[PDB]
Amino acid sequence: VDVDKYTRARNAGGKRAQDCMLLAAEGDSALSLLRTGLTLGKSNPSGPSFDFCGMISLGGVIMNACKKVTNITTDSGETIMVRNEQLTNNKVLQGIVQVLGLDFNCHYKTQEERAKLRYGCIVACVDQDLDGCGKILGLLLAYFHLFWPQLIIHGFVKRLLTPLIRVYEKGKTMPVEFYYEQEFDAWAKKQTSLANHTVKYYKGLAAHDTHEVKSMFKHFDNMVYTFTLDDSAKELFHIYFGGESELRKRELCTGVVPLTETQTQSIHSVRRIPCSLHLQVDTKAYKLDAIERQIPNFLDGMTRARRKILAGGVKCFASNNRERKVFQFGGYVADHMFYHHGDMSLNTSIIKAAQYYPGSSHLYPVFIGIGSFGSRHLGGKDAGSPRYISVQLASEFIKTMFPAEDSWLLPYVFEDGQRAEPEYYVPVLPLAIMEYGANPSEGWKYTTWARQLEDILALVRAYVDKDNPKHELLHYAIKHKITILPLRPSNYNFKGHLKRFGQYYYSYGTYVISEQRNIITITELPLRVPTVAYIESIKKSSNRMTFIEEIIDYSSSETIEILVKLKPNSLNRIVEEFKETEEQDSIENFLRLRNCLHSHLNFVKPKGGIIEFNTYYEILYAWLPYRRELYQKRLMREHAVLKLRIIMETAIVRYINESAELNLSHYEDEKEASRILSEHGFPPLNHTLIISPEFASIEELNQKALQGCYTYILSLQARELLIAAKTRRVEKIKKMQARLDKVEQLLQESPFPGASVWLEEIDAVEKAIIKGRNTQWKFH
Amino acid sequence: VDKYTRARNAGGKRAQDCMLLAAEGDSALSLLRTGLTLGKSNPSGPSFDFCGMISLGGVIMNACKKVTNITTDSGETIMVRNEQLTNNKVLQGIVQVLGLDFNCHYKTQEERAKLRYGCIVACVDQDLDGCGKILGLLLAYFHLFWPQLIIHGFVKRLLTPLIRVYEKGKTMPVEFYYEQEFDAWAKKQTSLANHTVKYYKGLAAHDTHEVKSMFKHFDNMVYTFTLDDSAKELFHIYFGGESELRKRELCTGVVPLTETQTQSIHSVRRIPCSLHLQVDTKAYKLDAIERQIPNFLDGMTRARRKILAGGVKCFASNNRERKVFQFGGYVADHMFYHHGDMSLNTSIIKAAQYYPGSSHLYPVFIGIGSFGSRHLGGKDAGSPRYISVQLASEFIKTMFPAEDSWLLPYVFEDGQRAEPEYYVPVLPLAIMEYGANPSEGWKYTTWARQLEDILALVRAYVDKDNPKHELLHYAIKHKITILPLRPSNYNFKGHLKRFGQYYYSYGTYVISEQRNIITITELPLRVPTVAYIESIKKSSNRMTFIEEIIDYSSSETIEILVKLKPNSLNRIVEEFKETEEQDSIENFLRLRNCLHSHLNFVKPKGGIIEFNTYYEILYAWLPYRRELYQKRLMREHAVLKLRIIMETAIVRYINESAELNLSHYEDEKEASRILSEHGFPPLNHTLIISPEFASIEELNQKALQGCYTYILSLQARELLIAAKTRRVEKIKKMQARLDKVEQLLQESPFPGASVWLEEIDAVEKAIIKGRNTQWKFH
DNA sequence: ATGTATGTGTGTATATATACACATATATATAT
DNA sequence: ATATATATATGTGTATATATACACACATACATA
Ligand SMILES: [Mg+2]
Ligand SMILES: [Mg+2]
């Protein structure tokens, strides 16, 4: 059959079969670009066309064959390699072995067996972000390595090389092109002003308009590169794409190793790429980026997408907290936070970042959700479409947990030249250990179970507050890493019971036995167990089905009530079949009613890279000093700003008192007015930095403050030359200097500066959490 | 059967005690399954012991257009279906669920107890699409096959709110069920500054306390359909295969509902089918005509007008690119769009496209990325996460002037302004582009006119020194034509011929008998290439003469190459005959088509209008633009006089405030007193300096009745000598402009006759500069 | 040589569907 | 009693698919005496 989304060349499998190309693209918008470009008729006499080029789609992400295949060493000696039934029945790989005419029991070592291919090179036209240049190009290389390495030896697998970033200067008709994101960031941070450049990001090939696809296809054969492999490559394919992760963990801790001048000149001159040198840059950079996207930071407890959602949601609902649809808020946060990915997964994260039900992931959600957001009974998988449902910002919890005057003092993620969101938030409470979570990633796994709220409040109040009895003893335990105050799992919104048997916790359900009608009434499932998955699991097991007649659900939307029915006189035969250990009952062995709480505390740290803890105490002890130094920073910044504002307004007061004697109307322009104001003892000030010190560090704030002009005094309205305005300004100067005395008294106290403000914020976060838990997280 | 939650008692001893809540999608089933499980928060509600769920799958197929009554020998017409209607997966589901039988009639109760449920209950949306269209099609299906169940109370429905309004303080909302009821309500108010209007698009947008208060009163809000005797004619008009009944009905608006009928419906809790079809279905069909047929003034539909308004609002600060889905989120937020996102993004994509043969010859946007080609008909664009749009800023500035948009009637959604009723362009843009749509009752199809003909017509109307001025005025008086009006052959390399009462368009071939090759070098107007090539391969009458067909096309240029089997040209010449209207080779290769028009537009203040020729559309267009120039000049004259009055108090206050000494006074009331005791005029400063949407009556009615904010909010920067000098020359420039405004209010033929000539010239050179740069504006 | 039925096609609407990667604990079905 | 494939599920990503309404000029497929 002609396979799906396939355009053959006119010379496939004929007398000039070997000189034809297959430009295998990633989707269909890329094929739309390739169809646009291979049909430059007389505007490109040196370019390719469909006389010797074809097109086929890779279907998204290629299946890997390096872990769906098995070796069988034959008794003749020569081992054989049998595929899986899933790998045999993939449509994309069946399609491309149908197009090129490949064979699985031909090694393609001589040339009269390589002349029986339908056309003799593959060229992968993929993207340049790490998701497409590193991942699926690596899996394609792995497929051709695992089944026919002789074609990678002789030269059969090729690729284009397109730009990811173009930067256009005003005036010049040649842009500056970049192939990697960190190269752009290193180029851009060295600059001094980027307000005459335009930065374009090209996710996918279909973002290239006409006047640059013509430039890309005047030089088509100039940018095709061919792969070679050496002996140092087979172990790297087994590390990066083999069935064991310990190799991948121990390689994937270290960062990417940059490229030498000889290797770079050799690649950009002779245009061949070593497969191992591709794996040790592009695929490794992909896997580090995937770790950064899919594993939470240990300070704020959230991923990178959810941190963009939080920043864009604080900024979106700023003026008035009116709700919007999920797709409209998603368009906002993809516009203003520089989100460079697809739109469907962003809307899925906005939906799941607002759910609240017994057993949801987030116990303290950022948003209030307005509509239908799914239930326990399908695990939140049955929410509405984003067309229907709405979200708004849970404003007082975000006000108390993430204080707004601390978001000025954080390191930010700069994207495309201007800032997007923080590197990390630092909440008032250790929010990384307060919720649930279970993800895979590259190399590692993330799994947490939430802690009690009162345990965490006891530990933080024991650390900070000086007259709690557990003050110095807790500091001793932080010096020696021993545990004193208990840190239990959370039992909120869960009615079953929890037991510790050795080095793990176990969570149990609740049944209700009856011999009057031989019916067991299940009333609760263990932690984070969906209902219909439990019912189908208890229905598939044939050893358990021999004792039940009918299994019926009567549960409400927030409370479990399952009803089984037993076959007559079958309560007795369960006990000999399903034996009762001390750790679980015979019914709880029978009805699948306990689970183990097994944690994988693998986080990412500031400045990137994995970190791996052994207990929740280690995460708390790593979290506390960041909040300590952030309090010290905000108090010193406030001290500097208050001195400078006293200095500013106690010259406005004397200008109001001396404007009649000064006679400002007599003078000609701003030059003579600034000169006659410099002679009467008015300080030159920087009005913008004093009114709005946005992100200015304290050296920046006292370094460019006294280097301004008299704009603070010259934009005074005649409204405020009145006597009630004088009284108002004098009393606000008195309040500012009283605040300055309070600030310089707060900078000294025990055990560290800013130790009472943080206790006040603990109490504020606690009452906001209590109010939210009472109102079903609606904050009525 | 998928998406079907079986009730516990379906098909048993108490099967007739059971309901089937047929919802419309899957989010609706999420709502209904949330509602039917309030176990002890709703002890008087329903549950799954007597209630099922099933999905209607979007929009129901109709059977009235897909069935045949065939007459047999015995004297009876049996009703035999179609193979397409028989294989519809949604209707197969409900027939298998309810246990219906097609050859039964269910007249007796012994037959009406052989079913599996007791009633079908349509839980549909309350917006006009779901309440009118698919509920009428469900009624039409049950009428066309089993009218005796509509007689005996089998088809039921819920009744939900469409708009809830929440008063501050009070604990009961106001619920409106129709949109025009809320619009007439909200126009009556004077202060809607503290009410929160909630639009509920589908029923899955309903919050938890709202669904609790809707499921405590479930049987309070179910209704039942009663079948009339006049209903057969209404079911044949609205859903039958004859369109002229539907044209003849749907001119006049919806008949309002009386008080006796209202009290009967809300009291005995039953619905006549005819009273439903003449309100809900008719209101839907009028709404679909409004959404799917253009206005003859601006040329654009409702969605494209929202997209242009949101694009002018979005790209105002800088003309920075956005994606398609991000700009779509913007225009769905600020222009109050109440529909899905996929259709809006498709509308933005097709509003940005520009290729030879696209719908728009003068697009609103500049498209950046892959926006499709001639060959697949523009259906080969990118996904909306890839491609970008940008505002074609100077064309939008010249065609739709910004100072005219303050003086237009607007549309209110939910209280706030969203977008105009129409734009009034400088050129008649409704006859300058293409289009081919169906709708309810009517068809829309246009073919664009030459630009030069339209420019000559409008310059003959407006300019008094043009020697075809009074002739054209006589022709407007007596409805005759003088000046030609040809179709647009721009970017088309075939040729056009007028034969009788229509134009035909012809493509170009090139023949060579030395190789038996015909080379097609041009297709007719708006013919996709791959659709043409696959259409020529299905005709086996033509396949017996050709061997091989190869496409060598460019990105924007056609080049098709056929191959003939030997000794078959003479058989083509003698077999496909030649008339004097089309060649034999063009008869063989499908190389002409007719430019056949259906000029059916909507008019202002709602309603269809149907024209006969393009001259009627031009002559209807001209007086709106004329009157709009007159009222913008009146507005400018008023604002200039008021601003002269405002600044010739500020300048003398700068002259006299050195000894007036306002720094001596206590507060602003004493200052306002002493300013009014020296002759300064009280002014409304926030409406003199920014008249946004104030008419001239409320401009000269409430602006001299303000305060002294204009004079008390001056910065001390303003009190210098250079600022005095600049205010003096600015007063001089406003005085000169006021003299020019009063000088050109009185000109001939009508006020503002040279200004519209200048805007003609600016739009024409912007169109030229956009055609030279492939509509990229380099 | 006519009276029939089908059959895509355009814009603006209504409601859905699917493949793949990644780690690890649990569950299921044979084969020494 | 035991190894060994196979299957599933979680979040953040990469790609695509498909049913219905509405009007009418036009094209292709057997019947019509
Ligand atoms: Mg991509
Ligand atoms: Mg609807």
Please identify which of the residues B166, B337, B386, B506 carries the catalytic annotation: B386
The closest alpha carbon to A354, from A338, A342, A371, belongs to: A371
Query: A82: which DSSP letter?
Result: E
CA separation, residue B533 to residues A39, B494, B505, B530 (Å): 17, 18, 18, 5
CA separation for the pair A251, A280 (Å, rounded): 10
Same domain, A78 and A136: yes
The C-alpha R_g of chain A, in whole angstroms, comes to 33
Say if residue A568 is preceded by a cis peptide, omega within 30 of 0. Answer: no
Residues 549-608 of B with CB under 8 A from A: 550, 552-555, 557, 559
- Residue linked to tokens 């920014």: B690
Element (H or E) spanning B140, and its range? helix B134-145
Q: Is the dihedral of CA A358, A360, A364, A365 positive or negative?
A: negative
Beta A53-57 vs A21-25: how paired, if at all?
parallel
A window 374-403: Cβ near strand D (< 7 A): 379, 381
Residue A9 lies in a domain: no
Provide the 3-class DSSP secondary structure of residue A654.
Answer: helix
CA separation, residue B527 to residues A252, B377, B606 (Å): 56, 8, 34
Of A329, A559, A669, the CB nearest to B720: A669
CA separation for the pair A454, A545 (Å, rounded): 43
Backbone angles phi, psi at A199, to 5 degrees: -110, 120
CA separation for the pair B139, B151 (Å, rounded): 12
Tell me the DSSP string of A522-557.
Answer: E-B--TT--HHHHHHHHHH-HHHHTTEEEEEE---S
Same domain, B331 and B395: yes
Tell me the DSSP string of B695-753.
Answer: -HHHHHHHSSS-BSHHHHS-BGGGGSHHHHHHHHHHHHHHHHHHHHHHHHSS-SSSSSH
The C-alpha R_g of chain B, in whole angstroms, comes to 33
* Closest ligand by atom to A340 CA: 1
- Residue linked to tokens 């799958």: B57
A85 touches strand D (CB under 7 A): yes
The closest alpha carbon to A217, from A84, A96, A37, belongs to: A37
Same domain, A140 and A192: no
A window 107-146: Cβ near strand D (< 7 A): 127, 129, 131-132
Distance A144 CA to ligand 1 centre (A): 22
Pull the structure tokens for residue A103: 């064979």
Pull the structure tokens for residue B162: 């469409």
CA distance A533 to chain B (A): 16
Distance A286 CA to ligand 1 centre (A): 13
CATH number, domain of B630, equals 1.10.268.10
Same domain, B528 and B424: no
CATH number, domain of B56, equals 3.40.50.670
State which residues form the domain around A700: 621-746
Residue B306 lies in a domain: yes
CA distance B160 to chain A (A): 15
- Residue linked to tokens 């005094």: A713
The closest alpha carbon to A712, from A644, A652, A645, A646, belongs to: A652
Which residues on adjacent β-strands are paired with residue A75? none
Same domain, B301 and B424: yes
Tell me, letter by letter, the H, E, C secondary structure of A340-389: CCCCHHHHHHHHHCCCCCCCCCCCCCCEEEECCECCHHHCCCCECCCCCC
Same domain, B655 and B707: yes
Same domain, B398 and B308: yes
- Asked if residues A264 and A216 have their Cβ atoms less than 8 Å apart, the reply is no
Provide the 3-class DSSP secondary structure of residue A500.
Answer: strand
CATH number, domain of A533, equals 3.30.1360.40
Task: Return the amino acid letter for A194.
Answer: L
CA separation for the pair B208, A357 (Å, rounded): 12
In degrees, rounded to 5, the angle at the alpha carbon of residue A518 between the alpha carbons of residues A517 and A519 is 90
B window 76-105: Cβ near strand D (< 7 A): 84, 88
Q: Which of A291, A317, A337 is the last residue of a domain?
A: A291
Q: How many other C-beta atoms lie within 10 A of the C-beta of residue B565?
A: 11
Q: Which of B372, B397, B430 is the last residue of a domain?
A: B430
State the binding site of A for Mg(2+). Answer: 26, 127, 129
Resolution (A): 3.2
Same domain, B133 and B27: yes
Pull the structure tokens for residue A556: 């409400």
Residue A658 lies in a domain: yes
The closest alpha carbon to B97, from B156, B55, B155, belongs to: B55
Q: How many other C-beta atoms lie within 10 A of the C-beta of residue B504?
A: 18
Residue A363 lies in a domain: yes
Provide the 3-class DSSP secondary structure of residue B480.
Answer: coil
CATH number, domain of B360, equals 3.90.199.10
CA separation for the pair A697, A634 (Å, rounded): 10
Same domain, A354 and A224: no
Query: A232: which DSSP letter?
Result: G
CB within 8 Å of B492: residues ≥ 6 apart: B356, B505, B522, B525
Residue A14 lies in a domain: no
Element (H or E) spanning B95, and its range? helix B89-98
Residue B654 lies in a domain: yes
Tell me the DSSP string of A384-433.
Answer: --TTT-EEEE-HHHHHHHS-GGGTTSS-EEEETTEEEEES----SS-GGG
Judge: B719–A665 Cβ closer than 8 Å, yes or no. yes
Residue B254 lies in a domain: no
Residues 454-473 of B with CB under 8 A from A: none
Give the count of domains, chain B.
Answer: 4
Pull the structure tokens for residue B716: 């001390």
Distance A204 CA to ligand 1 centre (A): 4
Same domain, A239 and A116: yes
Judge whether B125 is annotated as a binding position: yes
- Asked if residues B544 and B564 have their Cβ atoms less than 8 Å apart, the reply is no
Same domain, A154 and A251: yes
Residues 18-47 of B with CB under 8 A from A: 26-27, 30-31, 34, 37-40
B127 touches strand C (CB under 7 A): yes
Judge: A327–B326 Cβ closer than 8 Å, yes or no. no
The closest alpha carbon to B556, from A12, A52, A40, A352, belongs to: A40
Q: Which of A245, A265, A291 is the last residue of a domain?
A: A291
Same domain, A332 and A247: no
Q: In Å, what is the separation between the CA of A533 and the C1' of D1?
A: 32
Residue B760 lies in a domain: no
CA separation, residue A212 to residues A128, A162, A374, B546 (Å): 16, 11, 46, 40
- Asked if residues B355 and B367 have their Cβ atoms less than 8 Å apart, the reply is no
CB within 8 Å of A725: residues ≥ 6 apart: A656, A719
Q: In Å, what is the separation between the CA of A10 and the C1' of D29?
A: 34
B393 touches strand C (CB under 7 A): no
CB within 8 Å of A42: residues ≥ 6 apart: B554
- Asked if residues A746 and A759 have their Cβ atoms less than 8 Å apart, the reply is no
Query: B11: which DSSP letter?
Result: T
The closest alpha carbon to B287, from B240, B333, B255, B253, belongs to: B253
Helix, strand, coil abundance in chain A, percent, nearest 5? 40, 15, 45
Distance A476 CA to ligand 2 centre (A): 65
